[PDB]
Amino acid sequence: AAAAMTATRLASSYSIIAEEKLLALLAELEALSRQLAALTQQVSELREQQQQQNK
């Protein structure tokens, strides 16, 4: 009877991205990319400049 009551009680108890974000994101990436390409040139020149003076 308690088990039957316990059996009774246990059961009884129981997005779309806006273009504003995207267009801003693309511009930031291009801005960083152009800066990154510029810094690569300076480093590449620096290695050549030392290399040629040593040679």
Partner: protein
């Protein structure tokens, strides 16, 4: 109130609103419009007495 026990009672079938037919054939179907239908034994309100 005492509602029907859905768990500890076999042969219990959950009938939603647009299928239960009590007082059929004498009252409108899902609308306060004309009376449409065929007399027939009711099925929705489960008995709780007798």
């Amino acid at each position: 109130r005492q509602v029907v026990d859905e768990i500890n009672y076999k042969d219990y079938k959950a009938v939603t609103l647009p299928f239960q037919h009590n007082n059929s054939g004498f009252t409108g179907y899902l609308a306060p419009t004309m009376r449409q239908g065929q007399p027939y034994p009711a099925n929705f309100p489960y008995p709780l007495i007798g």
